[PDB]
Design a protein around this nucleic acid. Structure first.
Ligand SMILES: [Mg+2]
Ligand SMILES: [Mg+2]
Ligand SMILES: [Mg+2]
Ligand SMILES: [Mg+2]
Ligand SMILES: [Mg+2]
Ligand SMILES: [Mg+2]
Ligand SMILES: [Mg+2]
Ligand SMILES: [Mg+2]
Ligand SMILES: [Mg+2]
Ligand SMILES: [Mg+2]
Ligand SMILES: [Mg+2]
Ligand SMILES: [Mg+2]
Ligand SMILES: [Mg+2]
Ligand SMILES: [Mg+2]
Ligand SMILES: [Mg+2]
Ligand SMILES: [Mg+2]
Ligand SMILES: [Mg+2]
Ligand SMILES: [Mg+2]
Ligand SMILES: [Mg+2]
Ligand SMILES: [Mg+2]
Ligand SMILES: [Mg+2]
Ligand SMILES: [Mg+2]
Ligand SMILES: [Mg+2]
Ligand SMILES: [Mg+2]
Ligand SMILES: [Mg+2]
Ligand SMILES: [Mg+2]
Ligand SMILES: [Mg+2]
Ligand SMILES: [Mg+2]
Ligand SMILES: [Mg+2]
Ligand SMILES: [Mg+2]
Ligand SMILES: [Mg+2]
Ligand SMILES: [Mg+2]
Ligand SMILES: [Mg+2]
Ligand SMILES: [Mg+2]
Ligand SMILES: [Mg+2]
Ligand SMILES: [Mg+2]
Ligand SMILES: [Mg+2]
Ligand SMILES: [Mg+2]
Ligand SMILES: [Mg+2]
Ligand SMILES: [Mg+2]
Lengths: 140, 95, 166, 190, 26, 19, 97, 148
RNA sequence: UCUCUUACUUUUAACCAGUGAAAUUGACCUGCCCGUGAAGAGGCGGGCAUAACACAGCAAGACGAGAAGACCCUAUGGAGCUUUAAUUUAUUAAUGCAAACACCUGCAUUAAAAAUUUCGGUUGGGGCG
RNA sequence: ACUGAACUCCUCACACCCAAUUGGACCAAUCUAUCACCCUAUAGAAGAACUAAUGUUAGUAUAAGUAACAUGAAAACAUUCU
RNA sequence: CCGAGCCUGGUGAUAGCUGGUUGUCCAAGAUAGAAUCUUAGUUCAACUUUAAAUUUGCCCACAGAACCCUCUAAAUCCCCUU
RNA sequence: GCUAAACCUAGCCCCAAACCCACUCCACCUUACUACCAAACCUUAGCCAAACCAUUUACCCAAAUAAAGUAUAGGCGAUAGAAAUUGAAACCUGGCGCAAUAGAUAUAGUACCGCAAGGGAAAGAUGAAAAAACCAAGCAUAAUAUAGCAAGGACUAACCCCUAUACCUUCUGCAUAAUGAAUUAACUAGAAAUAACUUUGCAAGGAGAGCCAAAGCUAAGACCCCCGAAACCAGACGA
């Protein structure tokens, strides 16, 4: 046996270290461990997409809850805030709902106010003055 | 073919190829048309002329014949009165 | 083979300071190459795990298993050497701390089957290991009360945080 | 590598003793099908692709390349201040201690390769001194080679030796293609 | 017994770490 | 049609403790 | 576990033994010695392998030709079979044809 | 090696075999292109251009008679006695701008080459060497070592 | 035997003590209904169910396990048998012609006995095509 | 209106998601030359890397403490009885 | 374990058939056919890969590409400019 | 902490060199190892290749090289293959060989198996003196708690929540179908040419005779696996 692997222990250990926390023979038997570890790593890579997605649905759920406290629906809040030219993302709005409820009520008030301005503009077809909060800051 | 001889451990020439083909030094192989001696009575003069021709081979055919012959058959030969002497070298060939 | 259990009685601790609680005596003893299954031996080892020396000896005396008398012999030897060599005050004042069976070196034999075919029979051997500690046997862990459960549950509720937020 | 002969050999499945008969029938048993107990898969079988026989590693670089090698090595020795020229390799005493301490004083290095023109007409003093020593090595001019020069830190040549080297190495340039081996007589060569 | 030094050395280093982890120095 | 049984070599099952 | 629990005994190599110190001397015997000898003559080994190189099959043919008559019967039989096998392998088997 | 098949198992059929169809190399009729190639006489060409070059560079000496030995020693021409060379053929190439008075002995000479030699006041002769003597004349020193 | 089965004894059984195999095994933290996957799901989707652990029964499922099959097809893979398949007559027997003065030898012919080798492709499959 | 991807934008980065096949950049360990000297460097070599062949040998599991196996009775252990 | 015993050798028999073919990372990369005792295979072409040389490639606009059968469409080929 | 793991050296391999063996006594071809009575010479075949097969299909023969894979031979197919001619340098005690699944089968042709011919193993490790620590699988320490390829995202928190149809290989394509795997350790599978490409040397010449050459020649680097039939033949052994 002119050449034979002397470092096989370490090669096994590289895979096995990731398998320690598994249950059953997967944690210790290399043949089984390697297969589960490949799956673990693949899942880990694909989970990044889901993490981002799940955070956003969580934020929307929380925003919905907080809006509903003020009698406003989720689409109403987000839509009207955008129309007020305020650009607050869903993460921050959810944070505000939890931690700054007075600020959130203010934002809910603003959204509601803008919503009524929209309805008044829609009802008042033709030549009518623009809503006070409806008017938009122009950038050039 | 025999890649390694039992006696010498050398590549062997296929003698069939030597019996049928001429190698020009430039790399071209010359052959007779198949069936040129066959049933000439039933063949047109134009066809008979086409048959009585020395024709070159494909790249793929040339590559086959090269592999089936040793280096001896590929050497430059200075025959005293060679009818194919002029055809050994290429002139004004671009790629 | 390894024989580490024997070497455990060879440990010498430095002399204790006057302002220190008295160290309980520990005795390590084993029987090697018992002709008996380790799996069968396990039940008897498990039986006497928390027990005092006298309780264990009593239980073993009235057990019908082969391994019971072997453990009884080992326990008696351990009790004797505890008093003699390890300076244990009273032979009664001992309890089983560790009681374990391990595999022994085994022999392969042939078992003839009812054709040309056969099987490989294995002559089982085991080791019995015991650790005795000087002192009364420690009281068994009391069953969890309703109040303990209640407290744990409140603790869980109080521990919880607003997750995935600022 | 050119001198190398590897003497490593392993038995092929053919060469391993026994293994003629089929171990068991092909279809009958639940076992995997084998036809010899001496196949590479088996313990004590022949090797599939192991070293075969004495193997030779022999090849020749062109003569001109080898001569260029020598020239290049000499050039590099001079460029890096590792080449020294001597009128003669004559010592007052045959004591190896003398030679070592001389080299230390001259700041030659750990290892010195000394080259004389010819083996027979080597001075007795240097022969006596160098025979005992390990790092100091005495070779005739015919024995000069790239491996030795690279292995030794310092190269020491005699003035006869330097003239000899120039002649032999420069002959390689401005020579014809050989009609036959140079061992055979020519008009001008020997 | 496999010829080589590097693997044995690496393993000595591993055992050293294991000994240190099992019995930490004061 | 029929396959005959194969016996293991006897030495395998005839091993004893070394003393 | 196939790893040793102790370091192997340390290897001491005398880089300046006579064999290593005088390695390569006379490699240029021809070019520096009026071509009286070829460097190939300095090769010490089997009769059939002196200053010649070839693949396994070529080597076997050469061995059979040169020292075949002096060989032991069993060794000669093995060489015959080896040539016979290598013939079939090199001529009839492979990827490129 | 690709997917499992004859190629992948390493048992791919011989060069020239077309999988059953009559092979290309077989299909073609035999013709005597190489009928007596071995028994054909071959002559290495020496252009007047090359000869002039050798004279100018001093490789050959025009003061003495120029022969096969002289040409070979000058290394102007390489003659292989085996491979069925029968000597040197003097060829008309470089007839113009050949200005040398030489006594040359060649195995074959073209009309124009002879004319070129004679114009400059030189002498050309045509000689025959059999394979054995040709070997001897081209490499005299090895022959002398033979002892015969 | 059955209508139509019953009772008892022995073996087995189950429990206690001793000794202690085999086929088998990707890993399993190993549910149900409907659907999907050309059939077919413990594991996929929609519903439902669900503290966790033995022991004894059972054979509906795990296309349950081990070989050994039977059917169809394939290989320019085998083998046995037959002949009015092809190639032979080395062998045997007889005959004729040489040689030799009936036998032996050489050549040729006729038979017996064998020997070597094969049995293309399409058309349900088989016969006639 | 809103939700909704690896699409697109955003901050930073970029060779870093095809079967067979083909091209390239690295490289574990071993031996050798010369280094290096708590384990390495540049080269030259080669029996140079195994989650799979009802693979080979060895160890140990699963089924499984399962299937299965064994000693007629009393007694002074003289003996007698069935 | 007899439609032809067993053992050894030839023998590493042969197998277009079944199974297997061991470090890391990146890149390019898919379905016209012909012949064949041939359709479980191979050879040539087509496609694919690499390196090299040189100029066009693709997309395309006018113009242009059949009568007969009594009918016949989406289209195709060719193709400057871009 | 059990079972275990670990080790270095018995020996072997290829060469070189050198031409080996051979009676204490007694017994030993009869049923060998039992004191003592009336005849040898004789074409190998076949597998295999020819993609079937039927002629045919390399196999030492007097020592390198070159002529030359040339002349020749051949279902002129697969393939086989000279010679004339040239010419050969000689320092044994070495190893970019193996190190107990390796290297011999070998601790031994023993034990064991078979009527016989015949097949044929396994394994050992203290120290100068015995007149002196940790690591495979399997387990134990230490059984288990709704839910589901056994994980991943996570989380204060093991589980609960959400996401996720094992791996390999095969079939024109598909996996989820079928094949293979109890697990661990060790062992176990790409060998070479022509021609091209890349890098040097020299250059109308290159090459350390032969060979090639209308920029070529010389040298180097870089491409061609493993296991498995039923068979066939030869020589033995068996009623
Ligand atoms: Mg029986
Ligand atoms: Mg064999
Ligand atoms: Mg099985
Ligand atoms: Mg088998
Ligand atoms: Mg076989
Ligand atoms: Mg071996
Ligand atoms: Mg394929
Ligand atoms: Mg296939
Ligand atoms: Mg039961
Ligand atoms: Mg029981
Ligand atoms: Mg079993
Ligand atoms: Mg269903
Ligand atoms: Mg479901
Ligand atoms: Mg049950
Ligand atoms: Mg299932
Ligand atoms: Mg057949
Ligand atoms: Mg056959
Ligand atoms: Mg989104
Ligand atoms: Mg992204
Ligand atoms: Mg994108
Ligand atoms: Mg990118
Ligand atoms: Mg390997
Ligand atoms: Mg492994
Ligand atoms: Mg395996
Ligand atoms: Mg059961
Ligand atoms: Mg029972
Ligand atoms: Mg095979
Ligand atoms: Mg890509
Ligand atoms: Mg045909
Ligand atoms: Mg076919
Ligand atoms: Mg096929
Ligand atoms: Mg155009
Ligand atoms: Mg065949
Ligand atoms: Mg061994
Ligand atoms: Mg062995
Ligand atoms: Mg473990
Ligand atoms: Mg779930
Ligand atoms: Mg299986
Ligand atoms: Mg009889
Ligand atoms: Mg009888």
């Amino acid at each position: 046996l002119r050449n034979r692997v002397t470092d096989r222990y370490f090669r096994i250990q590289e895979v096995l270290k990731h398998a320690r926390h598994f249950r059953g023979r997967k944690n210790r038997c290399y043949r089984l461990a390697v297969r589960t570890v490949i799956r673990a790593f693949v899942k880990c890579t694909k989970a990044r997409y889901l993490k981002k997605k799940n955070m956003r649905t969580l934020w929307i759920n929380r925003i919905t809850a907080a809006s509903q406290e003020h009698g406003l629906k989720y689409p109403a809040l987000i839509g009207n805030l955008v129309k007020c030219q305020v650009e607050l993302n869903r993460k921050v709005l959810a944070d505000l709902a939890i931690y700054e409820p007075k600020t959130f009520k203010s934002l809910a008030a603003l959204a509601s106010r803008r919503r009524h301005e929209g309805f008044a503009a829609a009802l008042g077809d033709g030549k009518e003055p623009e809503g006070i909060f409806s008017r938009v800051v122009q950038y050039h | 073919l025999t890649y390694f001889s039992a006696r010498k451990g050398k590549r062997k020439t296929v003698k069939a190829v030597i019996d049928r083909f001429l190698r020009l030094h430039c790399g071209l192989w010359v052959r007779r048309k198949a069936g040129y001696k066959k049933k000439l009575w039933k063949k047109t003069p134009a066809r008979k002329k086409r048959l009585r021709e020395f024709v070159f081979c494909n790249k793929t055919q040339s590559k086959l014949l090269d592999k089936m012959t040793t280096s001896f058959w590929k050497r430059r030969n200075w025959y005293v009165d060679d009818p194919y002497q002029k055809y050994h070298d290429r002139t004004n060939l671009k790629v | 083979i390894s024989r580490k259990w024997e070497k455990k009685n060879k440990i010498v601790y430095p002399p204790q300071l006057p302002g220190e609680p008295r160290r309980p005596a520990e005795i390590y003893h084993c029987r090697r190459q018992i002709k008996y299954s380790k799996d069968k031996m396990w039940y008897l080892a498990k039986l006497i795990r928390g027990m005092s020396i006298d309780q264990a000896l009593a239980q073993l005396e009235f057990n019908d298993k082969k391994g019971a008398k072997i453990i009884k012999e080992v326990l008696l030897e351990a009790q004797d050497m505890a008093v003699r060599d390890h300076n244990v005050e009273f032979r009664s004042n001992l309890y089983i701390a560790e009681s374990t069976s391990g595999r022994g070196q085994c022999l392969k034999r042939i078992r003839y089957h009812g054709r040309g075919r056969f099987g490989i029979m294995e002559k089982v051997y085991c080791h019995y290991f015991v650790k005795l500690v000087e002192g009364p046997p420690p009281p068994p862990e009391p069953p969890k009360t309703a109040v303990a459960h209640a407290k744990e549950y409140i603790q869980q509720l109080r521990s919880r945080t607003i997750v995935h937020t600022l | 590598n050119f001198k190398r002969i590897s003497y490593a050999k392993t038995k092929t499945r053919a060469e391993v003793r026994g293994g003629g008969r089929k171990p068991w029938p092909q279809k009958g048993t639940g076992r995997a099908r084998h036809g010899s107990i001496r196949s590479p898969l088996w313990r004590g079988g022949g090797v599939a692709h192991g070293p075969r026989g004495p193997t030779s590693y022999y090849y020749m670089l062109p003569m001109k390349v080898r001569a260029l090698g020598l020239k290049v090595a000499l050039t590099v020795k001079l460029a890096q201040d590792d080449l020294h020229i001597m009128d003669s390799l004559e010592l007052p005493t045959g004591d190896p201690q003398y030679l070592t301490e001389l080299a230390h004083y001259r700041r030659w290095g750990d290892s010195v390769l000394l080259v004389d023109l010819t083996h027979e007409e080597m001075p007795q003093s240097i022969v006596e001194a160098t025979s005992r020593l390990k790092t100091f090595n005495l070779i005739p001019a015919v024995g000069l080679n790239v491996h030795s020069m690279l292995k030794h830190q310092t190269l020491v040549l005699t003035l006869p030796t330097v003239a000899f080297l120039e002649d032999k190495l420069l002959w390689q340039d401005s020579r014809y293609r050989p009609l036959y081996p140079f061992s055979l007589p020519y008009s001008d060569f020997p | 017994v496999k010829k080589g030094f590097r693997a044995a050395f690496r393993f000595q280093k591993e055992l050293e770490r294991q000994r240190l982890l099992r019995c930490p120095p004061p | 049609r029929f396959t005959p049984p194969i016996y293991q070599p006897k030495f395998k099952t005839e091993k004893e403790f070394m003393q | 576990i196939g790893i040793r629990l102790t370091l192997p005994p340390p290897k001491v190599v005398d880089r300046w033994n006579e064999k290593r110190a005088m390695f390569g001397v006379y490699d240029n015997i021809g070019i520096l010695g009026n071509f009286e000898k070829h460097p190939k003559e300095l090769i010490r080994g089997p009769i059939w392998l002196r200053g010649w190189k070839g693949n396994e099959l070529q080597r076997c043919i050469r061995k059979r030709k040169m020292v075949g008559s002096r060989m032991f019967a069993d060794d000669l039989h093995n060489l015959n079979k080896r040539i016979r096998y290598l013939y079939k392998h090199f001529n009839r088997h492979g990827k490129f044809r | 090696r690709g997917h499992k098949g004859e190629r992948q198992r390493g048992t791919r059929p011989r060069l020239g075999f077309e999988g059953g169809q009559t092979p290309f190399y077989i299909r073609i009729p035999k013709y005597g292109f190489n009928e007596g190639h071995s028994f054909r006489r071959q002559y290495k060409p020496l252009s007047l251009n090359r000869l002039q070059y050798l004279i100018d560079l001093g490789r050959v000496d025009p003061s003495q008679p120029i022969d096969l030995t002289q040409l070979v020693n000058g290394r102007g021409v390489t003659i292989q006695p085996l491979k069925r060379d029968y000597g040197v053929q003097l060829v008309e190439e470089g007839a113009d701008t050949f200005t040398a008075k030489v006594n040359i002995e060649v195995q074959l000479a073209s009309e124009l080459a002879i004319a070129a030699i004679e114009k400059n006041g030189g002498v050309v002769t045509t000689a025959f060497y059999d394979p054995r003597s040709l070997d001897i004349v081209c490499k005299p020193v090895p022959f002398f070592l033979r002892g015969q």
